[PDB]
Structures are given as structure tokens and as C-alpha cells.
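Input record (Table S2, row 1974):
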Amino acid sequence: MKDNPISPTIPLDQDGVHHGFLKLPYSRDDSAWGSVMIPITVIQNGAGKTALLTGANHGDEYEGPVALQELAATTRAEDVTGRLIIVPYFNYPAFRASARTSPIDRGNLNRAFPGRPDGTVTQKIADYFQRTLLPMADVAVDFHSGGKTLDFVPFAAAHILEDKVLQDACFAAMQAFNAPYSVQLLEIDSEGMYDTAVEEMGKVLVTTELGGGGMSTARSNAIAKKGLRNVLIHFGILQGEMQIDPSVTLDMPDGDCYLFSEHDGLFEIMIDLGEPVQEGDLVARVWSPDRTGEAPVEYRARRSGVLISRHFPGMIKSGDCAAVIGVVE
Amino acid sequence: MKDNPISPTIPLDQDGVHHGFLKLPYSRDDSAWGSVMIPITVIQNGAGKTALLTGANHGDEYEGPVALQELAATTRAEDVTGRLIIVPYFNYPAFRASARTSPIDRGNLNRAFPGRPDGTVTQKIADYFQRTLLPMADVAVDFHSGGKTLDFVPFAAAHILEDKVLQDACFAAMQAFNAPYSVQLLEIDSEGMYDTAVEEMGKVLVTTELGGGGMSTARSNAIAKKGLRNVLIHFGILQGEMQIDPSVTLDMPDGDCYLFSEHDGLFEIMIDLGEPVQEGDLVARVWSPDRTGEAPVEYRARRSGVLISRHFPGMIKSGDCAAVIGVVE
Amino acid sequence: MKDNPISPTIPLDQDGVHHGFLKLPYSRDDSAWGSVMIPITVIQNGAGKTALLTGANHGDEYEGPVALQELAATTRAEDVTGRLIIVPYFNYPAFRASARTSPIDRGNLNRAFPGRPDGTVTQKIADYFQRTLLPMADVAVDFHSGGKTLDFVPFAAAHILEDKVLQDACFAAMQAFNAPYSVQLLEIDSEGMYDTAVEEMGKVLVTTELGGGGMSTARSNAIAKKGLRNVLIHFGILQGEMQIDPSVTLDMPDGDCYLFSEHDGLFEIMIDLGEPVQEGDLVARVWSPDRTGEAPVEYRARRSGVLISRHFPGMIKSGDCAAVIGVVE
Amino acid sequence: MKDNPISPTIPLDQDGVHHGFLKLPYSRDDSAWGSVMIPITVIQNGAGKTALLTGANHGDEYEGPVALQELAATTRAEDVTGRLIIVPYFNYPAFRASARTSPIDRGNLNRAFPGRPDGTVTQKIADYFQRTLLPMADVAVDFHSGGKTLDFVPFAAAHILEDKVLQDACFAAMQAFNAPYSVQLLEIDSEGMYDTAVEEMGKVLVTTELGGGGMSTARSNAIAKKGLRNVLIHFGILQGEMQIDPSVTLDMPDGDCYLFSEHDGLFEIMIDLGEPVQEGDLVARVWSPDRTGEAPVEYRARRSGVLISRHFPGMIKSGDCAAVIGVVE
Amino acid sequence: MKDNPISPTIPLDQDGVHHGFLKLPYSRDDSAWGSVMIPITVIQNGAGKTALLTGANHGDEYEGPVALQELAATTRAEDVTGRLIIVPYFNYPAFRASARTSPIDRGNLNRAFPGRPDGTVTQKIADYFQRTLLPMADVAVDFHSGGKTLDFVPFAAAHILEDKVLQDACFAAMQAFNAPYSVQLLEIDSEGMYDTAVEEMGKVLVTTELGGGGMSTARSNAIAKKGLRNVLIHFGILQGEMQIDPSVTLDMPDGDCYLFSEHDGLFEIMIDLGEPVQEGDLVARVWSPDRTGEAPVEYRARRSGVLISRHFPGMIKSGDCAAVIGVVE
Amino acid sequence: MKDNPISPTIPLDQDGVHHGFLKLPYSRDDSAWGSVMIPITVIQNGAGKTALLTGANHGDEYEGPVALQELAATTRAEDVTGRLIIVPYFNYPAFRASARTSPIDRGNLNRAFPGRPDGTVTQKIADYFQRTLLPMADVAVDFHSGGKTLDFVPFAAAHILEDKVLQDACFAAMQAFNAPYSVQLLEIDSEGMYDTAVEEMGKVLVTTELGGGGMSTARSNAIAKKGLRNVLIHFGILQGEMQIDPSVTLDMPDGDCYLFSEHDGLFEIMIDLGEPVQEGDLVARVWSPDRTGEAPVEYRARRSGVLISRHFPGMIKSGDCAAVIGVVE
Ligand SMILES: [Ca+2]
Ligand SMILES: [Ca+2]
Ligand SMILES: [Ca+2]
Ligand SMILES: [Ca+2]
Ligand SMILES: [Ca+2]
Ligand SMILES: [Ca+2]
Ligand SMILES: [Cl-]
Ligand SMILES: [Cl-]
Ligand SMILES: [Cl-]
Ligand SMILES: [Cl-]
Ligand SMILES: [Cl-]
Ligand SMILES: [Cl-]
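Output record (calcium ion complex):
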């Protein structure tokens, strides 16, 4: 396989604090000899694990990026035993466009793995992570949130894996994160995902869904920072005492959606995130976007639980997931 | 002045429940003989005031539209003493585009008054309301929310007016709405506004800011429905007992913004809506959108209070209002 | 009033055949020192009336432009007694974009009159015609067709005017055109129209609707050529014998539309142009564009007649005129 | 091969009338957890063939969709012996955009076969038809028309195939359709086509070209309905007597085009669809789109015949097929 | 007249060096409570004239902006006797888009005067300069270059004015600038121009054309810096000795263009900027953009001189000014 | 492999002068039966080499196209001994869009080789050149310039190749071209390039960089014409005496860039093309595009030399190559 064309502007394996870029050549109409300059910080000191920390895998998901920018700007080499490789804006082009996917190639980075060194920009990013960065990491933390179109109760997630020893390691790392909700689930759609790239190498992956709507709050930003610091202590890279608060564990959500809208319209949710519903209760109504006087279409809960995910925008489209009802363990 | 070209598909002054459209002729490349069909419901019965009820003055503001669609679809003529003229989607084209302003003319309907019958689509809407609908109304309720770029604590607002008798009437109607926050304020920018069109006629206007972010919640939707029902009881059009809960009154916010961003970047708010801050406390930080390792720009509270408004999206732009700190009476 | 900035590249009042442009200065991002070069041909010889002949008042209407390009390219000075001022592409920018309206300013040239010399490109075109060209003309012929969104039976039209002497002159010119259908109608929407600009000067105007759909046929192109040659003989500018065929006269259509769609969908017309319908007969059905199994919405004839106009495209929008039923005299 | 991700919202093999959707997951910036909901109706009763019926393979071709929506909405289970699988909008996204090709991926569905379950939306549609739906069908009817850029005399077509037994079966089905014109032709460009997908399985395919211009007429819509009903009787699925009218058979058109334009301009056709031309007769002229006085470019018939296809829009581009001359058998 | 809504973030009349913004409120879909933050620097010390210095009146013209950014960043209060008001990016939105005109309103700022406080963004900029900034200035320097579509020999220009005393003052200031070419000309198109706004107040205006093509060179940047420093010494605001080099004076160019292209194509200029041509010499040829083998269209010099302006891009459009031939005094 | 679908409208191997097109079928929404008509001229006479001559490999690079259009229009068969195959607009769609890459597929033709007959338009062009045209050529001349974003001193280039006999042949052809600068360099990025397609067949390739900025001058156009005529004499196809002027040879530039910008802003170059710099001298400064008063970012020469390449536009982006310093042999 050809070598990936990315070259860092900083060394990745030297002691100290280094701030620079992954330079990905990108020739196009408005820059014949141009590049995508992906921000990166490496902090390395003494002996320990290397953690690869990413935010904005999707460009409209902000909690991880806030936590990672602060981490990169405020952590001293002397506080670290091991290595932090910090990339707050993973699909950097998508992040710059405030979009889930890249405006260069419409690439969903989270489904681009293992990528290729001679493909689209998004594929070249994936390939560099697959073959260059991940092999130097022992563990990975990849932050997600709902994005502009979805909102979730704030959870950390661990995966059901064939390797039960790794599964337990991932579960322990997820507990350390200590988000207000905790999940362990089988990933239905594992092919091409970043999580799969990490896990199939035998490495612990920590992942989240920390809110959504294309925004973040002080509370959600604080969940990301605590969770990040906690897992970094768990991995032995940072030192100190972990913050431990109550967490609500959700029964195996099957990761699937059952309340798909069959109509475009004005979206009216009937309960808010985290709140209970009984089987048959109204979860949402879709009102006509183009006339008055018409009965709304109703979406009812198929079982009892709490609302764990919702369509975010005021307007919903045919085929959109309206809501997901989860079950507290 | 020429007559406005809008013609309703239903009568506006007949007893009963009528659902139809304001047909605004709109000739353009993709429809030579086309129209904007603005949904409208009229419900009239017995004797009483006429209320003109609008939502989606701005197209990305959803609480009012939910409350008004439900009102139009579920109210019986026999429940009404007076007249309801219900227009859930006021700048209908903006609403269809999920945008603050119309995609036809970039018109901000809320600053288009008094409009003109021979202008842009937005101006023709304004002119029809100014000269045809408002003169048949005794009172008006015009719902707002922050839109995609802003979020507010949920308030009902009444204006400081030169006519102190009307000012008191507006204040009383705002109290009846009974949102979780209550405001009375002088409008700095009154020229061209819908509120001014109503108030300068000597008529009570009820207005709100019920959340934002281009979405609504069951809680915010419920605030709109209760407030609407309450004011309609206050105006004698609907009957029943009002729902009265506690409300927090905000001292005269001067309606202005003091924490303008001077930088594009990643927006980190430090406290959430409704939460307290002391003078000099950090309210927000703007992180570099294109590198790591840089100290963030900080925005500090100029006085003590609670956060009443915030920039919503993850990314903030130079010149955006970051936040507004209000003071509890 | 300022002088219009248009300058012809040819003289407009010299004997012979001259082909050139109306140069309208147009400074913009992609040409700081640029122009719109509107094609024009002047043919002048001996003594007689001047006719001003325009096509593509709307840019997606093609019969007139075909007839006028052929006229400009094939008429000898020696065949003319008077003057032809031939502008096949009247809203030239709209014509170049294959659009009803200009892509520069969205201007509908047909409603831009009297225009202004310091306005938008479309307004400057109108102003030049209003103050420079029309005053040198005795008569005008302005070709229309339905455009991309409409189709009409092919008619020549004369207007009901306050000046009954001019009305009769216009009627006679319309009869000479001898399209397969003939109409005389009161124009409901006369303000700003080209037709009004001509007629209020006391001048004969010949106008048409010769088909539509953004295309033309050999038959429709031939209707335009015969009609043009006929009226030019009637006006004494060209010599020869007129072609006279049968014409169907339509009773005063009121120029208005009664079968507006209230739904977006798949458009199914039930009779074709020129064909009869009885009162209450189905004229069109609108099928759901996004599901199967739903009963279609039906549009029925309000009176007996023949179909004289129809919505053209497969997809119809809310507020589109579906069809117009006319009555044979 | 991976399973296709499409799941129907209805059963496809149960007796009765079922209306629903093929849910194709489609995650993108404006819907992270979204779908393309392709309308589908299944009608099954008793014993017989299964027919797979598609319209809007190309999204700007309307006759088939009208005929299929009516079929899905008006056919009773009790009228059927066999199964109808009805998909009026085959490239559903293209249909929603009124475009030949999908706005998601620019996919021409008619050249996307056999597709793949992990490709673009258009490829996933093709793959589902190739591996799931077609194998449950005995016969297929796939409607085409010219689209926005082309118009054809209305024909049903059967293909010259290597399997002469199937060729005869296809020919018989085409005769039953009984369009006003009949063709049997060798398909030059068979790779990737839907027709090839059906035929190479040993299955009868019925295909058409029923007009064009991005519109349909009552006559063309009626041709589609009769042809559909006729072939469904021929296949034994519906009962009744076929409608048989005269049909004109065209000699093997070689499916190729010889009158390509080498110029952009104003398109003037000289004869209309179905009308005769002699060898060397003028078929079309292209006039300058940007000046007057220039001789037009002429396109002449290479042999005698009738006009069977034409460029539709008023403006023609360099490299566009102007016209095709066919020969009556 | 209403007050302009712009408020500076810095004082404009205080001694010292102040860097900030003109905050122009700008509410729109992507920022409800947003602003255009126009950069501004004020440097004031001791006694003297105030100069108002602008670059990027057009956003794709770069020499002035380079010279003004350096001036604002490197000049000490102690070096100044008077006041510098420095706005390197005058049509700031156009500058941010690298466009001649604003992407907000397509406004050409140079023709927006006197503007209005309640108009478009561009008009509000003009109004603030007309009524607030210009009245506090004694002199103005407004830099231009050709932009993306034009290139000029580098000149400073002074205007022929009715006030001959001011005319002489402007001429003297232009000589001090000492560009490699010098011009004094009557402005044909004076209405709405910035230059007119300054001059009609009785104030000296210094203007330029320092190159073009949407770029600048070290030589052209150096012409701007020397010229700026020179005029600031001439006005008594900066101290030191002026740089004086040879300058070529051009005879009254009439500011008009005579070699307009009547064709789109590949543009071949035959002589370069500053080089001589004789009457009848070939100045440019336009080659067909869509075929080979065709004779090019030729543009010949109407009189002897030197090339002072040229169309820049490889592709030229109908109506573009190809070139202007000037005459050395 | 399938045959490429391109068919010439002229013979390619007949004596004489032939002007026509490569017809590449291209079906799309705005032309169902359309084509890309690539201009081509073939001139053949007597005995000799065939040269394949291309311009506008990138569509915004104009010197080659000017030289080749003139060559195709002015060369007589009788002047030729051999064959010229002249394609002035190689990526024809990119040329028509004045873009580096095709607007159809964003294809960079120069990296599309060997292409495929069933791929994108750009790939089909490449495939036709790879398998049809190149095999009939003995030599190739492929013109480049910087494009809209880059400017270069005008050089002819020859490559360092493994076949040292061919390397010497290429070097000799480059010397004959006799541009004002001469280079021989190892191509770092050879995979997929046109140059590689030619050279790996054992054939001499002549290539250039003759200026840039999306424009050309009489001087740069003249460099292209002389160089073309010279190499055609060297190859024995045209007769006459070569023009020989001084040429500056550049030491092996490594073809790489070391002064990448890490900042968006206003670009100020400090020396111009061809001018000397010493190690550590300032080559460029990037000024803030959104405020005043800030120190600029500086880019310094890493070694002594002359400026051989520069970023062209006024605005530079993060990751853009600012400049390249070369060394005179
Ligand atoms: Ca440790
Ligand atoms: Ca009452
Ligand atoms: Ca006569
Ligand atoms: Ca049967
Ligand atoms: Ca002084
Ligand atoms: Ca020879
Ligand atoms: Cl994903
Ligand atoms: Cl507002
Ligand atoms: Cl009109
Ligand atoms: Cl096809
Ligand atoms: Cl200007
Ligand atoms: Cl390249």
C-alpha cells in the first residue's frame, strides 16, 4: 500500500507539549497547491499509555471539541505519565462547515474506515488514523453528540464484543467516564466505523453521546471534561482522584429506531429527554406544515421507559427517527 | 393606496369553524400563475373580542406554531364567545424554509410594517395584516422564540408605551399569560415592527420569547399552550379558569447586548439559562476554530444576575451576541 | 430625468438593414467594465409606419424569438415601406438563462414599466423602451407564450380599452394576425405592463399566447410567422396578400383562474388543450407525491367550455393554476 | 454479499391490498437517522404471475407514474389473480426533485444495475430490485418518457435478444400494450440497464417511451393506462377484454442519433412528431442565441421517414441530439 | 434623518493609537443578533489635519489594504501631527468574500453614496461615512485597483472639478503621491461615487488605480506605501522627506472604453501594459471557446498610444472592455 | 476492456487540415441525449512524426490554448511533414468553466490517468488519450501555467527518468523549447499523471509552466508560440530556423513547497517573480483579514535564490503554498 500523504508539522513522539497540524495535501480549484491543516497537540512525558483523543468525528458535535481544546491548552507535560495525542476537530473540514459530513466529499468519517491513502480527503484522514496514529495508541476516546438533527440523554457507551476480556476492559473504562447515563450495547452497524477500527486491534475504546442539537451547554461541556479526566486517570496517564456521581444504566437498547416518521411536518414531542412514558402513551405528533384544521399524526410508545433520543428540529421529514424509548436497568 | 392582492379562500366574519388560506399571488420562474397559500383558521361564535393570533413571524421559531395548530384543530365554535383568527405560520415562506427570513426576498416580516400592497411577498403579507386583518382585531398575540441562533429563558413581554392606560392593559395581559418569566421593557427598535403596528392602533399586544435553537420541547410547547389559553380567557373569548403558577420578573432589561463576540470560533458557555452569575464571572469563552494550544478569548459578566439569553450554535461569529445577563426583580 | 445609459451600436433611423446591439452598461463581480449586449436589427426603407417587434419579454417563451430571428435575417430593405425595429430577445438576460425572469434582478420585464434609467438592469431596459424606442414607434407587436409552467391554445389578443377608437384598431390588428384562436379581453392587472405602456400612448398593440412548456413546434412557430407577416402587411410595412384561415373566437375570458391547486403533487390533466368539458366534469386530479393508495384531489369544471390553459409540468404546487376553461363564441 | 439495508413497511407476499414504503436508511447532514421512504403497493390474490411495475425510473417522466398511482389506488384484491408489486416512483429521490437523476448522487437508476447494497442510494435501490424484488417477479413493466429534454412519438418497445423464445414473448407483450407506435430494436447500450437485469433472468420486460417534455397529457396518460391494463390481462393477472387500436410499426431504428447539434442556440424544429420528411429536407435550424442577422445552422434528413424523437427545450446545446428520423414498416 | 446604527468600539477623537471596529448591526438567518465588525484604527496626536484612509472600497483590490494594514500596525502616535482614521477594508463584507461587491446585497460601495441609515448594509456603511466620518476629515485617500477582471498601469488620479481652487489642491496631492503614472480627468459617472461625496464637501481626494487581477506585487504594494506616506507628508500629518521618482503623465483619458468585445471567447492580448501601439495595430484577438479552425475576431487601436487598461481573465465575455489605449503627454 | 465511447467527427489519419470534435456522450438532467464536444484539429502531410499537442489540461491555464488555437487556424497542410493532433482545450469542461477541474466530476485530468472507458467524463477523456490517441503519437507537448491561484517564472521542464536515453531526448526537446527558464526535475508525484502516461510508453514529453493567475500576457503567449514552433521544428514536423534566446537554468528544484501558510489572511509578497532573496530574508507576510493593529505573520527564505513560484490571490488560506525559492545554476 502507498504511504499516506499526511505529514505532521510537529514530532508525535517527543517529550513535552507540541502544537501543530496534520498537513493533508488538497489540490482544488481555489488552491492548486493547498492543504487541509488538521489541528493536533501531542503531550508526552515519562512512562505510560498513549491515548488518542478525538472530537468532531462529526463536525456539528461540540462537547468533545470543547473538552479537548481545553485539555490541549491547559495540560502541562509534567502532569502526564504517558502520551496524549489530541485532535479536537477530527473531520476538520466537516467541523469548519458546522456539518456532520465533509463539504469536500460528503464523507461521514465515522463510516470511512479503514480508508485509503489515495482516496477522498475523508478516506485519507481515516487511512492516516488506521495505519499511523492508532498503531501508536493503546487506547482511544472518541466523542459524539447528536448533531443538528438529534438529541440524546448524555451517555458513555461500551460495546458488546466477541473478545470478552476486551469487552470487560471497555466496560470498566465506560464506568470510569461516569456520565449521567451508562450503556453497554451491541453495535448493529459495525462495518467501516472508527470504533471497530480501534476494537478489532484489541484496544479499549471509550465513546459517548453527550447531547446534541448542534450546540452544547455548561452541563454537557462539564460532563465531557469530567469523563475525559476520569478515563485519563483510569488509563494512568493523568493523576488525581476521579469524580464519581450517580449514573443511570440503560438496558440494552438495541440501537435501532421504531418511531420513524412517515410524514413531513411540524414536530411536536410530548415528553422531554429522560422523562418516563408508559406503553401506548403519545410520544410525538406531526402537524401539517401546509394547512390548518387537520388531525395530527401520532406516534405512540411501543413499551414503557424513558425518552433517550429525539428528533431535534422543529420540522421533521418523512423517514426521520422521531424518538427512541430506552429502559432503565 | 391600491388594494392588497390577497384573497382568503374562506370568509373571515362568518359564525363557525373555517379552515383555508390567504392566497397571495406570486408569479415566478417555477410558477407563472402561482400563489403563496398562507394557512388560516377562523373560529367565530356569539359576542366578543376578535383576537389575531400569529406564530412563525420568524420561520425557525416553533412553540407558537405548535400551540396555534392545536388551537385551530381542537377548538369548537361553541367554546368561543368572539372570534379567533389563527395564522400559525405568519411568514409562511420563511416557515416552509425553516428560516428566520423569507427565501423569496430575505424579508424579516417583523420589521416589514406597515408594508405595501405592491412590494415584495413579505411586504404584501405585512400590508394585508396592517390594513385588513388588524383593523378587525381588538387584540393580538404574536409568538416568538430565539430561532436557530439564540436561546432565551421562556418569557412573556409587555411594552413600555407612551399611552400608560394601554401600557397597563398590555401588562395585565402579559401577567395572565403567566410564563415562567415575566418582563416589561421599552422597545429600543420600534420602527417597522409588528408590535408597533398593533400598539399604535391602541390595541393590546401579547408577545413572547419561549426558548429557541430552532426546536421546541414538551415544556416549552406547554408554556405556549397555557399562555395562549390564559390570555384568551383574559380577553373573554374562551371560558374556564386560568392556570396560575409562579413567575420570575426580570428588571428592565434594556433589550441590548453587551457581550458581542469579536472572534469566530468554538463557543463555550460557562453557565446555563436561568443560572446565576456574579459581576466579573466568566460567562463564555471562544476557542480557536483552526489551531490548538491557544488561550481562549473570555467574556465576563459586567454585573450580577442570571443568564437570560445565549448564542446557540457551537460555532460563534465575529459580531454575534454571546449572552445577555438579566436581573431578577 | 437622467438619460438612459443604453447606447446602440448601430443607427436606429438610417435606411437599410442594420444588425447590432443595445449596449447596457452592467458592472458586476465577474466584469467590472461589462455590458449586456441586447441584439437588435433595424430595417428601414421609404415611407411608412415604424413597428417595434419584441420576443422573449419572458425568457422561456420561444415562438416570437424564432419568428423575429427569421424576420431580421431574411427581410430585404427593398421589401420594406417604413421601419422594422426587431428585438427577438427583449429580456435578453432572462432569455440567456432560459428563464421567465432575469437572473440579474429577478425582474419580470412585463411588469417593470415605465422603469427607470438608474434602476436594475430590467428597469433600465424598460426605461429605454418607454422613453426612447416606443416614442419612435407607431405600433408594437409583443409575443408571449406560456413559458415552462403553462400551456395555452394559440391565440392573438386585443384589449378592452377606454379609448374605443384605439380598441377597434387593436381588434382589427388582432384579427389580421389570424391565430387559430382570437380573444378580446379587459386586462385585470394593467399597472406596469408593457401592453399598457404602448396602449396609453395611443398606439396599437398586438399580443399573443402561442403555446408554452418552454418549447415550440413547427406549427406554433408557423403561427407566429404568419401572424407577424399578416400584421406587418396590415400596418403597411410589408407588402403581399395576407394568409387567412378559420379562427375560433373565445368569449371574454375574465383572464382570471378558478382552479388553483391547494396541494403539491403529481398532476393528471383529464382533457387536452382545445377539447370540450361540461360543467362538473373532472378537469384535473392531483395525486400524492409521497405515498400510494390515497384518493387523489379532484378539480371539476365550474362551467361548460373548452380547455384554454393548463399547468404544464408533471409536478404541481400548492397555489398553482391547474387549468382555465374558456367559452367559444 | 451483504444484505441490502432496505426493509419494507408492509409484507410483500400476503393476500390483499397493502400500501407502504421501502425504507432505505439514508444518514446525511439534515437527517442523521433518516431514510428514503419509497412508496410501494402490493396487491395479491389467488394464483398467478407476479408483475413488477415501475414508473419514474427517471424522475421527470410522468405517464407511468400517473397510470401506476391510479392502479395502486383503484384495483381491488378480488380483481387480481396473481400479484402486482407497484412502485410508481422508482428513483424516488429523482422524482421528488423533478429530475432525470437523483439529487443525492446524480445516479441514473436506469444504468445503475446490478447495484450494490453498500453503495450510493441509487445503487442500493438497484441492488434491492436486482436481488430481492426481481427474483419474486415473473414479468416487469418499466415506463419511460423523454424527460424534460426530449419528446418521442408514443411507443411500446420489445428487444432483440439472443434468447429468441424470450424475444418472441417480449414481442407479444409489446403488441398487447398496443401503443400508437410499436418497435422492436436491439439495445446498443445494454450494460447496467434495468431492462438487461430483467431480460437476462429469462423474464419478459415491457418498456415504453410515451411522450416527454417533463409533462403528460390526457392522451399520453390514457396510452399508459390502456397499455398497462392490456399487458396485465396478457399476463393473466387482471381479467377482461383488451383494447385494440391501430398501431404503426417502426423499422428497426438503430437507437442511435445522427443529427447532433454542433452549436448552442435557439432551436427551431421544421416538422412535428409523427410527420413525414424526405431525404435532404430541413429537419431543424439553430439560430444564434446572442446576435441577429446571422444565417442559421441547418440540420437535414439523411433519409426519408417520420420524426420520431426531438430535442424539446427552446434552447439547444452543442452535442444535443436534435431529432431522430424513423421509418414506418 | 434617523441616526446611523453603527457604533465604534473605540473612541475616534482621543489622542493615541486605538484599534477596534465599526459595529454595524446585521440580523440574518445565521445570526439573529449579529453584526458586521468593520476594522478601524485611529491614530491622533498634537495638531493637524484629519485624513480618512480607505482600502477595499471594492473587495478584490489589494494594494491599499496592504499599505493601510501596515500603516495601522506600525505608526506611533508620536510620529503623527493630526489624525489618521484608517479603514483598510472599507466594503468589509465584499473584502471577506474576495469580491468587488458585497455578498449581502450585491452593493457596489463606490456607487452607494450618500447611502441611508435604514437601507442595505452597503448603504448603511456609505451613510456612516457620508454623515459621521467624512465631516470629521479634512482630506481622504481612497485606494483602487482593477479587481479580478481588469489591470491598469499604476496611476494616481485627480479630478477636473467646477471648483478650480480645489481642483488645483487635488492635482497637487496627486503629484505628491508620485505613482509611476499620473492622471487628471473629468469623471463621466460622478453620481453616487465616494469621490463625489468628498469633493463636493470642498475636500481634497486622492485616488488611484494601482494594478489589478485580484492580486498585488511587491512593486505595486510599494507604490501604495510610498504614495500614502508621500500624501500624508504633503498633508502635514506625518513628517519626513517625500520620495520623488519620475512619473509619466497621461493625456486626458476620457475614462471611457472603445474596444468592447462583441464575443465570448479565449482572450489574446497583443501588447502588454504600458507598451506602445500605433493606430490600426492589433490590440487583442478573441478566439472561439468552443471549436478550432475559426478565424479570431480582432480589435484594433483607434489611435496611437500605450496600453493603459486591459481585460484580465483568460476568458472574455460579450460586452467586456478588452483594453483602453492612453496617450502620454 | 470496453471500447471508449468517444468518436471523432473527423478522420484522424487523413492528409490535409481537418477541424472537428471528439464526441463524448454525456447524458444528464439538462440533456438526456447529450455530449461533450471536445474541439480537435488534425493536420497531416507527407512523412514524419505525429505530435499530440494539448492545452488546458487544467481549464484556468491559457498560454497553451492561445498558441494551439493559432496553430490549428493558421498552419497549412503543405507546411507539415508528419502529423499534428491539436487539442487546445484538453479538459474541455474545465476550460468552459474557467476552472482547474471539471465542474461535471471535479476531475483533475492531470491525475486521472490511465482513466477508464466507463468512468466519469474526466476518466473517459483520459482513457481515450491513453489507449487511442497516445499510441498514434510519437511525441507529446502538454502546456501548463499556474492557474488562478499560482504564478511561476516561465519555464519549460524535462523529467529525470529511469530510462536515461529517453531522459536525454526529453532534455534536448526542453532546450529546443527555449523558454526564458529551463528546468530538469524528478517528479515526486508521478502516479496518474499525463506526463507519466507519455514517458512510460518510451515517448518524449515537453511540458511547461508559463505564468499563471488565470490570465496570459503577450509576452507569455509569445513564449508558448515560439516554444511550440521550436519543438515542432526539433521533431521535424515543421520546417524553418528555431528562435534561440538566453535561458536561465534552475538547479533541481525538488518540486516541493516549504513556505506553507498556517493562516488565512491578506497576502503580502515581499519580492516579485525572478527576483533574488538571501537566506532569512522576508519572502511574504500574512496580515489579519479581520482586524487592525496585529503584527503580521512572516515567512522567511530558508536559503538564497530567486522567487520561482508564488501564491497569486490577495487572500491566502491556511495550508496554501506562499512561495517557492529556486536556485540559478
Ligand atoms: Ca501513570
Ligand atoms: Ca366571553
Ligand atoms: Ca406601405
Ligand atoms: Ca388469471
Ligand atoms: Ca504637521
Ligand atoms: Ca521533416
Ligand atoms: Cl455514523
Ligand atoms: Cl426582528
Ligand atoms: Cl407578466
Ligand atoms: Cl438511461
Ligand atoms: Cl465603481
Ligand atoms: Cl496536477
